[PDB]
Amino acid sequence: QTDIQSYVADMQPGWNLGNTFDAVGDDETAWGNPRVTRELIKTIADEGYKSIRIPVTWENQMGNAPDYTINEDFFSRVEQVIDWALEEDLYVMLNLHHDSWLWIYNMEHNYDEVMAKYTALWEQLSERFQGHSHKLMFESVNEPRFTRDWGEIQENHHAFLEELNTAFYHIVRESGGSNTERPLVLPTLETATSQDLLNRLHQTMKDLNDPNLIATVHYYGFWPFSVNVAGYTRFEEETQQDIIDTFNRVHNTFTANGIPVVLGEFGLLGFDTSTDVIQQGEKLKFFEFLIHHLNERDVTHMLWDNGQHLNRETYSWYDQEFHNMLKASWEGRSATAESNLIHVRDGEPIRDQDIQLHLHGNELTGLQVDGDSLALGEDYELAGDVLTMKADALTALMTPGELGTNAVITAQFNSGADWHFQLQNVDEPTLENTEGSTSNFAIPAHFNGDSVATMEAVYANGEFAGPQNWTSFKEFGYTFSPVYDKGEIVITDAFFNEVRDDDIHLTFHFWSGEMVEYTLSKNGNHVQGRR
Amino acid sequence: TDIQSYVADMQPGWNLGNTFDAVGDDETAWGNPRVTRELIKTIADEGYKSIRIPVTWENQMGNAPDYTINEDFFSRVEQVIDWALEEDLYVMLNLHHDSWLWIYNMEHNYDEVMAKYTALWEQLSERFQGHSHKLMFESVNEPRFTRDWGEIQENHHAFLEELNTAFYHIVRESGGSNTERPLVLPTLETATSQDLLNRLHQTMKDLNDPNLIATVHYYGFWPFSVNVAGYTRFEEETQQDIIDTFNRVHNTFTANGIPVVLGEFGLLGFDTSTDVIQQGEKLKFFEFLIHHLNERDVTHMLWDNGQHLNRETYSWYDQEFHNMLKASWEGRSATAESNLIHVRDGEPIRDQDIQLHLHGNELTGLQVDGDSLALGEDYELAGDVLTMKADALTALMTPGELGTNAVITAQFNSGADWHFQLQNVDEPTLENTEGSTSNFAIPAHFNGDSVATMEAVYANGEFAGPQNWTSFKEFGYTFSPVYDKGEIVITDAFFNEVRDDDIHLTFHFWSGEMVEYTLSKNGNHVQGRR
């Protein structure tokens, strides 16, 4: 192995301090996160991460021509956080972030200004961090883009991005000192992962003829699964194949020829709305699959955390199950199941229930409820990889009448993370009539322990209604959102803004399998809903 | 004839909207107070001689097979109608928003919809059996039915004819004062195209009744009515739409002895606010429109959801509007190229020309705060070009104070007085901003000016925003200038239909000037720069 591949490999795994210094505002707190504490970096270190990415947006602390001097207090705060990260023996990756689209976008029609502010910025940076360790790396530009004359992308953009990469490179290398051997991270265009882009970054990197370069890509999952659109509610073969093809191209083009790859940002696109857009078990399966294949192709990954995943005020993970699956996927594969839920109707006699496992190379060793192992034979059976909860066990663990999560059955294995089943006592969900404006329309609902997976919207003639007209399945969150603590289903203003004055048939898909029908009557700014 | 004397004697009409017609538990669900008898008294003494009472009954109808109406809501409708005829007004009673609430579903729920229909008009005719004959029944408001492949189709015409005939025969069979009770029947969607008018024509000719009235609605040429596609002016396409529309109504119905009640009119855009259309252009539209309505004996009823007369003051929110309306009841009023005269604070003041449109009348003087001003020394008139003299404007204005300095009232031998707003304007200025799509507002210094429309183009020249087929915004729904807070908001609806890119906006001001602005959208965040 080469020295640079041991470097990138020593970064694994990585974490993004997102929506902080990268926020487009007057300071790092414009987008809701608190100012960086020395405790934050320390916990990020003690949770198993060995590299941290610090994205920064610089436009709103830059001066005017020709110096564009960075404001010293913002600069010194960035520098302070980096210093802390290096006290914690972490790798630090520093970039210019949202400046990408803020002004660098504008290079075809503002070339000398964009490269004046660019050159000046990386001069200040390189001079500032000259005497720093080699565990500080420079990343040229986050997800670069340029102005569409005829559309994205052709011709101009590759040239522009190459000129940015080589200018940045030559600045840092000409700074000397620790910047001579300092690794430099360079991106594909929009950090995308298609073959042409990969071959242009490849030819730029050969062009620069440097041993200490690193290739970057971003990935937020197969688009429709990542945002819960077009019915892709489960983590099925299409997402998996997208992962496999994407990182097989990345691996063949970069890792296989000795240039290491940092997947500098990964996640699910839908988490820009909420982590509730993807169902829990399918999220876990997605992340386990992804981290498995990335490990198999020596791709060092850095999770994008804008503040939604670790509570930067408690310093603990908002969803421990998620982080447990991540930190198991660092070491190896974890067993999963067809679902993380077990459904049991409150009205039916309780029967033995089968559950398909996904051993992923591992073996089952027991099941626990509230920390206590369960009874072999009397509580559960295992036939190959089909696990069966016995009737008496579910009857004991459940409460007649109490709808919702009655218990959690924990499947333990010889290796990997525990898989947790939510034992749901459910009835058939029912809706109610309502009437209101497009601006505040909510269907009163009785979820009865169930869970909404997706919603379709078709006109009474069968045409696909609502936004993203090419499919019947609307997008989660942006067009509708189930609010369980307030017992209703919201229909958003964005949905009604793309529907004609007509009657709308909606068909709510629940994770129990059931489906509820509802009809809306749309005229202007008023809508009535009936069962 | 008795029927044409009836319909002609209704002129003019007024709609009691967003009241009993609101889809809710009672008349106030959509923000209006409960009807006062002072309300209708005032509506009568403002010169109107007919009132339209739209009512939606769905949420106070019982269950099969009676579908009985709730007695207190019923007693409230009857109370309002009785009152309206104490003021010697004409009343037209209709089925309102039920149109789309359940009547829509006629192809797939025939016997239920006509069961509720028959029951409803039975309650109706039985309740008002012994009432005066200047109370009218209107069958169904703007009828529509479910699109199989779209509007309009074969099925819809049949359906509407069946409702018309069922209602007709129900009231006719009720007897009493309902025997010569006049009946108001609508074309489908109250639209004004030839084929539809001829379907209603054969419908009434089929029904062979002397006491029938044809109703249609009209809310103006679509793009001007909602301020889209750059139609900021009241120019001839709008006017030609008026002329063609009511030439068809007059040829097909009035000329053949059946009178037409335009039971609801306005401009569609006021469903947002009366501020989407410029004041003077609104006035010209209404004067033109009412002029032709009178010329073809079309009895008008204004659509007032509470937006035109303040039902709390019992006075008109915009007196200029109502003054122009009821002056056009009697005849045409002179209009002008513009409602305001612009003069920049920094340049020396000049004589200013302003084109009038003497719609058959002559100017007799001008007024500032009720006082006539000197002829010759302050203003000249050459043919139809009026000229404000420099000294008059210099005296009437204050250097530095931008905005409305004075109002010049043009008096004429006939018609409404026209009021010009004397605006001292500077070049409007914008500032940089940063924010989310959900609440994005550009800090603005209007400097006395007024935004007419907005353009949105991507840096490649493609039309951005909703209704991508034109560069010109829809007013209100995509952007709104709020002068009281000195900013220009861009709504969630606009950003929800634009790609992550740079958008060039071009603000059109009524002074003629145009200021440019650029947005950079990425996800749910947008950058604004001058």
mmCIF file of N, CA, C and O in Angstrom, chain B residues 433-495:
data_model
loop_
_atom_site.group_PDB
_atom_site.id
_atom_site.type_symbol
_atom_site.label_atom_id
_atom_site.label_comp_id
_atom_site.label_asym_id
_atom_site.label_seq_id
_atom_site.Cartn_x
_atom_site.Cartn_y
_atom_site.Cartn_z
ATOM 1 N N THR B 433 -30.006 40.464 0.337
ATOM 2 C CA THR B 433 -30.646 39.715 1.406
ATOM 3 C C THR B 433 -30.267 38.245 1.288
ATOM 4 O O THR B 433 -29.747 37.789 0.267
ATOM 5 N N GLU B 434 -30.550 37.506 2.358
ATOM 6 C CA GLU B 434 -30.294 36.074 2.426
ATOM 7 C C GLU B 434 -31.375 35.456 3.296
ATOM 8 O O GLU B 434 -31.694 35.999 4.358
ATOM 9 N N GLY B 435 -31.940 34.340 2.858
ATOM 10 C CA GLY B 435 -32.985 33.724 3.653
ATOM 11 C C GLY B 435 -33.484 32.443 3.026
ATOM 12 O O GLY B 435 -33.016 32.009 1.968
ATOM 13 N N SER B 436 -34.450 31.841 3.713
ATOM 14 C CA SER B 436 -35.079 30.611 3.267
ATOM 15 C C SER B 436 -36.167 30.903 2.239
ATOM 16 O O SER B 436 -36.675 32.023 2.129
ATOM 17 N N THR B 437 -36.518 29.867 1.474
ATOM 18 C CA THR B 437 -37.630 29.969 0.534
ATOM 19 C C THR B 437 -38.952 30.266 1.233
ATOM 20 O O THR B 437 -39.825 30.918 0.650
ATOM 21 N N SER B 438 -39.123 29.797 2.473
ATOM 22 C CA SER B 438 -40.419 29.916 3.134
ATOM 23 C C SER B 438 -40.763 31.346 3.535
ATOM 24 O O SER B 438 -41.950 31.658 3.688
ATOM 25 N N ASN B 439 -39.769 32.224 3.710
ATOM 26 C CA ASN B 439 -40.052 33.622 4.060
ATOM 27 C C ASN B 439 -38.909 34.469 3.487
ATOM 28 O O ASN B 439 -37.979 34.903 4.171
ATOM 29 N N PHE B 440 -38.989 34.721 2.185
ATOM 30 C CA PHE B 440 -37.971 35.466 1.456
ATOM 31 C C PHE B 440 -38.567 36.790 1.003
ATOM 32 O O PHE B 440 -39.563 36.811 0.272
ATOM 33 N N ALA B 441 -37.954 37.889 1.440
ATOM 34 C CA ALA B 441 -38.430 39.231 1.131
ATOM 35 C C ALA B 441 -37.244 40.137 0.842
ATOM 36 O O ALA B 441 -36.297 40.199 1.632
ATOM 37 N N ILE B 442 -37.309 40.837 -0.284
ATOM 38 C CA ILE B 442 -36.238 41.736 -0.716
ATOM 39 C C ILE B 442 -36.478 43.099 -0.068
ATOM 40 O O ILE B 442 -37.524 43.715 -0.325
ATOM 41 N N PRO B 443 -35.561 43.591 0.766
ATOM 42 C CA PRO B 443 -35.713 44.955 1.293
ATOM 43 C C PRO B 443 -35.728 45.968 0.158
ATOM 44 O O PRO B 443 -34.851 45.968 -0.710
ATOM 45 N N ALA B 444 -36.738 46.833 0.166
ATOM 46 C CA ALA B 444 -36.986 47.734 -0.948
ATOM 47 C C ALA B 444 -37.210 49.156 -0.459
ATOM 48 O O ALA B 444 -37.709 49.385 0.647
ATOM 49 N N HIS B 445 -36.828 50.110 -1.304
ATOM 50 C CA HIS B 445 -37.159 51.524 -1.151
ATOM 51 C C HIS B 445 -37.950 51.919 -2.394
ATOM 52 O O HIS B 445 -37.363 52.238 -3.433
ATOM 53 N N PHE B 446 -39.282 51.886 -2.293
ATOM 54 C CA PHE B 446 -40.111 52.179 -3.458
ATOM 55 C C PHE B 446 -39.947 53.618 -3.928
ATOM 56 O O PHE B 446 -40.140 53.904 -5.116
ATOM 57 N N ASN B 447 -39.580 54.529 -3.025
ATOM 58 C CA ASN B 447 -39.344 55.934 -3.370
ATOM 59 C C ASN B 447 -40.559 56.549 -4.064
ATOM 60 O O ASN B 447 -40.430 57.307 -5.027
ATOM 61 N N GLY B 448 -41.751 56.209 -3.577
ATOM 62 C CA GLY B 448 -42.983 56.730 -4.126
ATOM 63 C C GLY B 448 -43.548 55.957 -5.297
ATOM 64 O O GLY B 448 -44.640 56.296 -5.771
ATOM 65 N N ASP B 449 -42.850 54.933 -5.779
ATOM 66 C CA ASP B 449 -43.225 54.242 -7.003
ATOM 67 C C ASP B 449 -44.172 53.087 -6.676
ATOM 68 O O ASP B 449 -44.634 52.932 -5.542
ATOM 69 N N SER B 450 -44.473 52.261 -7.677
ATOM 70 C CA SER B 450 -45.424 51.167 -7.520
ATOM 71 C C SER B 450 -45.073 50.061 -8.503
ATOM 72 O O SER B 450 -44.871 50.327 -9.692
ATOM 73 N N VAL B 451 -45.005 48.831 -8.004
ATOM 74 C CA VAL B 451 -44.666 47.676 -8.830
ATOM 75 C C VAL B 451 -45.899 47.227 -9.604
ATOM 76 O O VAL B 451 -46.973 47.030 -9.025
ATOM 77 N N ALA B 452 -45.745 47.060 -10.917
ATOM 78 C CA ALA B 452 -46.823 46.579 -11.775
ATOM 79 C C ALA B 452 -46.764 45.074 -12.006
ATOM 80 O O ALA B 452 -47.773 44.381 -11.836
ATOM 81 N N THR B 453 -45.600 44.556 -12.392
ATOM 82 C CA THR B 453 -45.414 43.130 -12.623
ATOM 83 C C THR B 453 -43.939 42.801 -12.429
ATOM 84 O O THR B 453 -43.100 43.688 -12.248
ATOM 85 N N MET B 454 -43.637 41.503 -12.455
ATOM 86 C CA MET B 454 -42.290 40.989 -12.247
ATOM 87 C C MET B 454 -42.006 39.911 -13.284
ATOM 88 O O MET B 454 -42.921 39.218 -13.739
ATOM 89 N N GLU B 455 -40.769 39.884 -13.763
ATOM 90 C CA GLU B 455 -40.274 38.822 -14.624
ATOM 91 C C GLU B 455 -39.286 37.932 -13.872
ATOM 92 O O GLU B 455 -38.654 38.362 -12.905
ATOM 93 N N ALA B 456 -39.194 36.667 -14.293
ATOM 94 C CA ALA B 456 -38.258 35.701 -13.714
ATOM 95 C C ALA B 456 -37.683 34.889 -14.862
ATOM 96 O O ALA B 456 -38.404 34.123 -15.507
ATOM 97 N N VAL B 457 -36.398 35.071 -15.124
ATOM 98 C CA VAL B 457 -35.711 34.371 -16.196
ATOM 99 C C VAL B 457 -34.455 33.733 -15.619
ATOM 100 O O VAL B 457 -33.753 34.350 -14.809
ATOM 101 N N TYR B 458 -34.181 32.490 -16.015
ATOM 102 C CA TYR B 458 -32.914 31.873 -15.657
ATOM 103 C C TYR B 458 -31.784 32.509 -16.459
ATOM 104 O O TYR B 458 -31.994 33.082 -17.528
ATOM 105 N N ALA B 459 -30.558 32.363 -15.954
ATOM 106 C CA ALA B 459 -29.414 32.992 -16.606
ATOM 107 C C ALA B 459 -29.233 32.552 -18.055
ATOM 108 O O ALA B 459 -28.453 33.180 -18.780
ATOM 109 N N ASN B 460 -29.934 31.509 -18.495
ATOM 110 C CA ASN B 460 -29.897 31.066 -19.881
ATOM 111 C C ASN B 460 -31.047 31.609 -20.720
ATOM 112 O O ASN B 460 -31.116 31.309 -21.917
ATOM 113 N N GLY B 461 -31.948 32.390 -20.131
ATOM 114 C CA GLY B 461 -33.057 32.959 -20.866
ATOM 115 C C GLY B 461 -34.342 32.163 -20.820
ATOM 116 O O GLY B 461 -35.344 32.601 -21.398
ATOM 117 N N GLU B 462 -34.347 31.009 -20.160
ATOM 118 C CA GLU B 462 -35.562 30.221 -20.031
ATOM 119 C C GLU B 462 -36.496 30.860 -19.011
ATOM 120 O O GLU B 462 -36.054 31.387 -17.987
ATOM 121 N N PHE B 463 -37.793 30.812 -19.292
ATOM 122 C CA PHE B 463 -38.780 31.385 -18.383
ATOM 123 C C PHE B 463 -38.837 30.571 -17.095
ATOM 124 O O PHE B 463 -39.118 29.369 -17.120
ATOM 125 N N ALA B 464 -38.577 31.228 -15.968
ATOM 126 C CA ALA B 464 -38.585 30.571 -14.674
ATOM 127 C C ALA B 464 -39.973 30.653 -14.036
ATOM 128 O O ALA B 464 -40.926 31.179 -14.615
ATOM 129 N N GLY B 465 -40.082 30.117 -12.824
ATOM 130 C CA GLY B 465 -41.282 30.232 -12.027
ATOM 131 C C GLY B 465 -42.470 29.474 -12.582
ATOM 132 O O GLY B 465 -42.377 28.775 -13.597
ATOM 133 N N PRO B 466 -43.615 29.591 -11.915
ATOM 134 C CA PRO B 466 -44.829 28.931 -12.408
ATOM 135 C C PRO B 466 -45.344 29.589 -13.681
ATOM 136 O O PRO B 466 -44.947 30.696 -14.051
ATOM 137 N N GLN B 467 -46.281 28.897 -14.328
ATOM 138 C CA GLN B 467 -46.695 29.187 -15.702
ATOM 139 C C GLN B 467 -45.501 29.586 -16.566
ATOM 140 O O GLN B 467 -45.391 30.700 -17.079
ATOM 141 N N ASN B 468 -44.598 28.619 -16.705
ATOM 142 C CA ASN B 468 -43.346 28.718 -17.448
ATOM 143 C C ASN B 468 -43.484 29.254 -18.871
ATOM 144 O O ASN B 468 -42.469 29.524 -19.518
ATOM 145 N N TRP B 469 -44.705 29.392 -19.387
ATOM 146 C CA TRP B 469 -44.862 29.809 -20.777
ATOM 147 C C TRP B 469 -44.641 31.302 -20.994
ATOM 148 O O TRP B 469 -44.714 31.756 -22.141
ATOM 149 N N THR B 470 -44.374 32.077 -19.944
ATOM 150 C CA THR B 470 -44.115 33.499 -20.109
ATOM 151 C C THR B 470 -43.139 33.962 -19.038
ATOM 152 O O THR B 470 -43.032 33.356 -17.969
ATOM 153 N N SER B 471 -42.421 35.045 -19.342
ATOM 154 C CA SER B 471 -41.469 35.599 -18.385
ATOM 155 C C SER B 471 -42.172 36.357 -17.267
ATOM 156 O O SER B 471 -41.632 36.468 -16.161
ATOM 157 N N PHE B 472 -43.371 36.865 -17.533
ATOM 158 C CA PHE B 472 -44.081 37.742 -16.611
ATOM 159 C C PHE B 472 -44.795 36.939 -15.525
ATOM 160 O O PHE B 472 -45.581 36.032 -15.825
ATOM 161 N N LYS B 473 -44.537 37.306 -14.266
ATOM 162 C CA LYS B 473 -45.123 36.703 -13.077
ATOM 163 C C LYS B 473 -46.635 36.826 -13.046
ATOM 164 O O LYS B 473 -47.252 37.593 -13.788
ATOM 165 N N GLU B 474 -47.231 35.994 -12.203
ATOM 166 C CA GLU B 474 -48.546 36.282 -11.666
ATOM 167 C C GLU B 474 -48.389 37.153 -10.424
ATOM 168 O O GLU B 474 -47.599 36.833 -9.529
ATOM 169 N N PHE B 475 -49.142 38.245 -10.376
ATOM 170 C CA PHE B 475 -49.142 39.120 -9.213
ATOM 171 C C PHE B 475 -49.773 38.418 -8.014
ATOM 172 O O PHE B 475 -50.752 37.682 -8.154
ATOM 173 N N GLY B 476 -49.201 38.643 -6.833
ATOM 174 C CA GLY B 476 -49.756 38.103 -5.606
ATOM 175 C C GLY B 476 -49.367 36.670 -5.306
ATOM 176 O O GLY B 476 -48.776 36.387 -4.259
ATOM 177 N N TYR B 477 -49.694 35.752 -6.218
ATOM 178 C CA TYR B 477 -49.478 34.334 -5.948
ATOM 179 C C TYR B 477 -47.996 33.978 -6.002
ATOM 180 O O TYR B 477 -47.561 33.038 -5.328
ATOM 181 N N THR B 478 -47.209 34.717 -6.788
ATOM 182 C CA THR B 478 -45.778 34.477 -6.902
ATOM 183 C C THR B 478 -44.921 35.532 -6.219
ATOM 184 O O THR B 478 -43.778 35.235 -5.860
ATOM 185 N N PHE B 479 -45.437 36.743 -6.035
ATOM 186 C CA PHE B 479 -44.691 37.820 -5.402
ATOM 187 C C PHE B 479 -45.684 38.883 -4.964
ATOM 188 O O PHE B 479 -46.753 39.031 -5.563
ATOM 189 N N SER B 480 -45.322 39.626 -3.925
ATOM 190 C CA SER B 480 -46.205 40.699 -3.494
ATOM 191 C C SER B 480 -45.418 41.855 -2.895
ATOM 192 O O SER B 480 -44.645 41.665 -1.946
ATOM 193 N N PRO B 481 -45.588 43.069 -3.423
ATOM 194 C CA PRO B 481 -44.976 44.252 -2.805
ATOM 195 C C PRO B 481 -45.806 44.680 -1.604
ATOM 196 O O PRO B 481 -47.000 44.959 -1.732
ATOM 197 N N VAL B 482 -45.178 44.728 -0.436
ATOM 198 C CA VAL B 482 -45.831 45.195 0.780
ATOM 199 C C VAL B 482 -45.161 46.509 1.152
ATOM 200 O O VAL B 482 -44.007 46.538 1.600
ATOM 201 N N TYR B 483 -45.877 47.605 0.907
ATOM 202 C CA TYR B 483 -45.318 48.943 1.039
ATOM 203 C C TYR B 483 -45.223 49.351 2.503
ATOM 204 O O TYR B 483 -44.277 50.040 2.901
ATOM 205 N N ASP B 484 -46.203 48.936 3.312
ATOM 206 C CA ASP B 484 -46.214 49.264 4.732
ATOM 207 C C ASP B 484 -45.014 48.688 5.477
ATOM 208 O O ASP B 484 -44.683 49.175 6.563
ATOM 209 N N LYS B 485 -44.346 47.679 4.917
ATOM 210 C CA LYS B 485 -43.163 47.093 5.538
ATOM 211 C C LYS B 485 -41.917 47.227 4.670
ATOM 212 O O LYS B 485 -40.879 46.644 5.006
ATOM 213 N N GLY B 486 -41.991 47.986 3.576
ATOM 214 C CA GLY B 486 -40.843 48.286 2.742
ATOM 215 C C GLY B 486 -40.053 47.080 2.272
ATOM 216 O O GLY B 486 -38.837 47.012 2.476
ATOM 217 N N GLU B 487 -40.730 46.126 1.637
ATOM 218 C CA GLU B 487 -40.073 44.918 1.164
ATOM 219 C C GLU B 487 -40.932 44.272 0.086
ATOM 220 O O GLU B 487 -42.121 44.570 -0.050
ATOM 221 N N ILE B 488 -40.308 43.379 -0.680
ATOM 222 C CA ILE B 488 -40.981 42.621 -1.728
ATOM 223 C C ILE B 488 -40.824 41.145 -1.392
ATOM 224 O O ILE B 488 -39.713 40.603 -1.452
ATOM 225 N N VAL B 489 -41.927 40.492 -1.047
ATOM 226 C CA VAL B 489 -41.908 39.080 -0.688
ATOM 227 C C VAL B 489 -42.010 38.228 -1.946
ATOM 228 O O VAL B 489 -42.711 38.576 -2.905
ATOM 229 N N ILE B 490 -41.260 37.131 -1.963
ATOM 230 C CA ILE B 490 -41.407 36.071 -2.953
ATOM 231 C C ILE B 490 -41.888 34.825 -2.224
ATOM 232 O O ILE B 490 -41.241 34.357 -1.278
ATOM 233 N N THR B 491 -43.022 34.291 -2.667
ATOM 234 C CA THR B 491 -43.769 33.304 -1.905
ATOM 235 C C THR B 491 -43.191 31.905 -2.094
ATOM 236 O O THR B 491 -42.404 31.640 -3.008
ATOM 237 N N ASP B 492 -43.588 31.006 -1.188
ATOM 238 C CA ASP B 492 -43.231 29.596 -1.314
ATOM 239 C C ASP B 492 -43.660 29.029 -2.660
ATOM 240 O O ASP B 492 -42.959 28.196 -3.245
ATOM 241 N N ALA B 493 -44.814 29.472 -3.166
ATOM 242 C CA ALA B 493 -45.323 28.950 -4.431
ATOM 243 C C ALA B 493 -44.373 29.225 -5.589
ATOM 244 O O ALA B 493 -44.276 28.409 -6.514
ATOM 245 N N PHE B 494 -43.668 30.359 -5.567
ATOM 246 C CA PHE B 494 -42.722 30.651 -6.638
ATOM 247 C C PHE B 494 -41.517 29.720 -6.582
ATOM 248 O O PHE B 494 -41.165 29.083 -7.581
ATOM 249 N N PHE B 495 -40.866 29.635 -5.418
ATOM 250 C CA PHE B 495 -39.647 28.842 -5.305
ATOM 251 C C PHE B 495 -39.915 27.355 -5.495
ATOM 252 O O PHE B 495 -39.017 26.612 -5.910
#
